[PDB]
């Protein structure tokens, strides 16, 4: 099962999974309330997969990609690895399933702690325009993922502050209305 917790407090080395002592578990009931959503697919089947195909035809995720972020072929790794690390949020959700290999998406909780989100193999998330988010590598520093938009995409981060916008305005509406 997929697993969350809230960081510790260290700054060093952001590809170590920085849980905090003692072990704060997050579930997935938690990070619904903060708007991110989950599913858990078999990555094998993903060209050919009514399962996912059920998902994107919901969710109106009618464009797709695959971007594979590793040291060699990615080109301007070691920029884009940067920013993807800096906290930042989407005027558009963020989705993502995971094909091959691992990372960390790490969401503000509604007092604005930093919850660690490991994703592997199989597992889909979205996360909601507006989310203060990032995301690195873990320590395995490679990750194959399909990138799914509602519509033509636009990849344009808003490093935080970005709160003027109506997306963030509407996302903490809609974080008043959760548990
Ligand atoms: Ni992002």
Redesign the pocket.
């Known amino acids: 099962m997929v697993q969350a917790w809230y960081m510790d407090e260290s700054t060093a080395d952001p590809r170590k999974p920085h849980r905090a002592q003692p072990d704060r578990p997050v579930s997935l009931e938690q990070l619904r309330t903060l708007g991110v959503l989950y599913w858990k697919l078999d990555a094998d089947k993903y060209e050919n997969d009514p399962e996912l195909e059920k998902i994107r035809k919901m969710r109106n995720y009618s464009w797709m990609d695959i971007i594979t972020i590793c040291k060699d072929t990615l080109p301007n790794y070691e920029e884009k690895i940067k920013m ?1 690390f800096e906290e ?1 949020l ?1 005027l558009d959700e ?1 989705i993502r399933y995971i094909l091959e290999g691992s990372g960390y998406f790490d969401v503000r909780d509604k007092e604005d702690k930093w919850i660690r989100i490991s994703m592997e193999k199989g597992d889909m998330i979205t ?1 909601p325009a507006g989310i203060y ?3 690195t590598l873990d320590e395995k520093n490679y990750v194959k993922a399909m990138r799914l938009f509602v519509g033509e995409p636009v990849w344009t ?1 808003y490093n935080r502050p970005a709160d003027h916008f109506d997306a963030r305005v509407q996302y903490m509406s809609f974080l008043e209305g959760t548990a």
């Open positions: 993807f930042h989407h963020e996360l988010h990032r995301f981060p």
